[PDB]
């Protein structure tokens, strides 16, 4: 560790801890910057050499973290919990958590190499046949727009086999080392550490109680979509009393169903709420999507994107051939100047929403950039995920789309409302079971309830249990279908997305009230509301300096996650779908839980 970066001496008391934290931040920023920079260099340009550079920077971060972590514990282990300065306790608590820095060198190097290799495998995997499709954009567009069962099956099977199978032995090794590292921080396993970020002794029970309130909405959306799919694909491939084949819902993970909106739209005579074609017809490109997102933020008197963002960001997939991580992401370089987005942006309505999601991350970074480095986080991770989604809730309203030139015809009638709420349910309600289940899978892997011998058995158990889908071809424990989802090999926790899909409607309700809006929750548009901007700004500027329950209370009047705002937003379509399924005599659920569809005849033969 360079001498400038090493901790000196500080007294063993709260006034020394404060000087400790100030000396820390000085050097932390440099170490974070070099780490993030090397990660950026790799993720925008996947090369063996860039992976080597990224691993060296990771090792330096581990060295730094160990030195300052062990100093924090040497000087403050039994007194930091009683510090009078609550932000200083949060700072000290973070610095003394060593994570992978608890591992011996050789195991640190093994750990960093496993992260690199799992990342390279996921983001460079291809499906072939010899020319080859990448996940983004090739397979993505096939899942979104093909309606050929055999073709969707070719993309779904090909991707899951190509990405998941080679990852499995690496993921086993990563789990063991991760657990070894965090057990030396006092946690029973890594998942317990991840869950600790919500500082709630009843987290899993609280989530289970939210899901109980939401599940009826998903069950009715599912039954209704399943009927629509049956009318297109027929009784051979859709079982009206079984799970839906997992490749037919518009998305490689069946996690958002927006893309099948044209098959499910109940009133096709109303305005077409999927404005993708209008964006194409109009010549929208990535940089227009990012400027339109930015201007919503500035309409609220939040910050524009700095020049460093426009000069540094990667907003389209590189045409120079080179391999990149295409999964969108938002980057804080911890120097208070550089912030970027890396996105292989495609010109589509859901991508416009994803642009807002990612710019919400950036706005958080811009607003808390002057807090101590340790507090440059969301009040909890689900807060960070929710910011951009809240604005996107306003952007997608038919009235807002009209304002920005994407929907010439506007209508305020009950049919149009049901169309809109149904489209939003395909995006928001359909995701809830998946958002909930992914970290149930990973918590069980980390705790050892799901050993490698049951990785895929337990994944599909949860996928069927919650989402009511089945794999369209047979799977066994050679397959590792969880690894075919980006966040698993790239070790990004998931429960934040379940939390944010609940939270964002709590935020939306509060911001709409603050803006003086007095109509139905789902037609609210907070655009140009500076009062709403100021209320959002207060949350963003808090970072993680204060308990999330208190930040939430100041914002929305309640100190807990609550499904009532989401249920209020969707109420009309919740009632409509219930009525429809009854009249159609649907079975809610999937009691033929063993059912799987047959293979197409002439599969995979006829793919050319």
């Amino acid at each position: 560790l360079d001498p400038g970066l090493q901790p000196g001496q500080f007294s063993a008391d709260e006034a020394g801890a404060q000087l400790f934290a100030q000396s820390y931040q000085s050097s932390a920023e440099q170490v974070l910057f070099q780490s993030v920079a090397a990660s950026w260099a790799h993720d925008t340009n996947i090369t063996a050499e860039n992976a080597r550079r990224q691993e060296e920077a990771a090792l330096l971060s581990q060295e730094f973290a160990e030195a300052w972590g062990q100093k924090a514990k040497e000087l403050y282990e039994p007194i930091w919990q009683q510090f009078t300065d609550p932000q200083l306790r949060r700072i000290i608590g973070a610095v003394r958590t060593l994570g992978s820095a608890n591992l011996p060198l050789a195991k640190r190097q093994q750990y960093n190499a496993l992260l690199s290799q799992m990342s390279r495998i996921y983001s460079t995997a291809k499906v072939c046949l010899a020319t080859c499709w990448s996940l983004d954009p090739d397979l993505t567009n096939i899942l979104a727009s093909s309606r050929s069962y055999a073709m969707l099956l070719f993309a779904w099977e090909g991707w899951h086999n190509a990405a998941g199978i080679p990852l499995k032995p690496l993921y086993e090794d990563f789990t063991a080392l991760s657990n070894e590292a965090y057990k030396q921080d006092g946690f029973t396993d890594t998942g317990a550490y991840w869950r600790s970020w919500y500082n709630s002794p009843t987290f899993e029970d609280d989530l289970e109680h939210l899901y109980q309130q939401l599940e009826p909405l998903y069950l009715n959306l599912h039954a209704f979509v399943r009927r629509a799919l049956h009318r297109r694909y027929g009784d051979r491939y859709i079982n009206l009393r079984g799970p839906i084949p997992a490749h037919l819902l518009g998305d490689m993970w069946a996690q958002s169903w927006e893309n099948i909106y044209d098959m499910v739209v109940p009133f096709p005579d109303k305005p077409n709420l999927d404005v993708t074609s209008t964006m194409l017809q109009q010549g929208w490109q990535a940089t227009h999507m990012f400027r339109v997102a930015e201007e919503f933020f500035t309409s609220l008197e939040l910050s524009p994107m700095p020049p460093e963002f426009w000069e540094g960001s990667m907003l389209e997939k590189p045409a120079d051939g080179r391999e990149v991580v295409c999964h969108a992401s938002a980057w804080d370089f911890y120097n208070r100047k550089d912030f970027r987005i890396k996105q292989c942006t495609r010109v589509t309505m859901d991508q416009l929403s994803t642009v807002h999601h990612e710019m919400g991350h950036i706005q958080y970074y811009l607003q808390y950039k002057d807090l101590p480095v340790s507090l440059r986080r969301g009040a909890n991770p689900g807060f960070h995920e929710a910011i951009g989604d809240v604005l996107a809730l306003s952007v997608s309203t038919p009235e807002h789309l009209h304002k920005i030139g994407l929907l010439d015809r506007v209508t305020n009638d009950t049919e149009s409302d049901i169309n809109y709420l149904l489209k939003m349910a395909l995006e928001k309600i359909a995701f809830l079971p998946f958002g909930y289940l992914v970290d149930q899978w990973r918590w069980g892997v980390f705790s050892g309830r799901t050993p490698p011998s049951r990785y895929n058995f337990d994944w599909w158990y949860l996928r069927t249990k919650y989402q009511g889908i089945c794999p369209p071809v047979t799977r066994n424990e050679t397959h590792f279908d969880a690894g075919a989802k980006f966040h698993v090999p790239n070790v990004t926790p998931y429960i934040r997305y379940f939390v944010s899909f609940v939270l964002q409607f709590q935020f939306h309700e509060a911001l709409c009230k603050e803006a003086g809006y007095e109509g139905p929750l789902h037609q609210c548009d907070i655009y140009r509301s500076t009062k709403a901007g100021a209320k959002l700004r207060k949350v963003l500027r808090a970072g993680s300096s204060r308990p999330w329950q208190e930040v939430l209370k100041d914002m929305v009047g309640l100190d807990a996650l609550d499904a009532q705002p989401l249920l209020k937003y969707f109420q009309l379509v919740t009632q409509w779908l219930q009525e429809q399924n009854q009249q159609n005599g649907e079975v809610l659920g999937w009691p033929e839980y063993q059912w799987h569809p047959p293979l197409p005849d002439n599969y995979p033969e006829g793919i050319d």
Binding site: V36, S61, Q62, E358, H384
Partner: peptide
């Protein structure tokens, strides 16, 4: 801990 926090990404 140990490393920089993950870049923030969509579901």
């Amino acid at each position: 801990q140990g490393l920089p926090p993950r870049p923030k990404i969509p579901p």
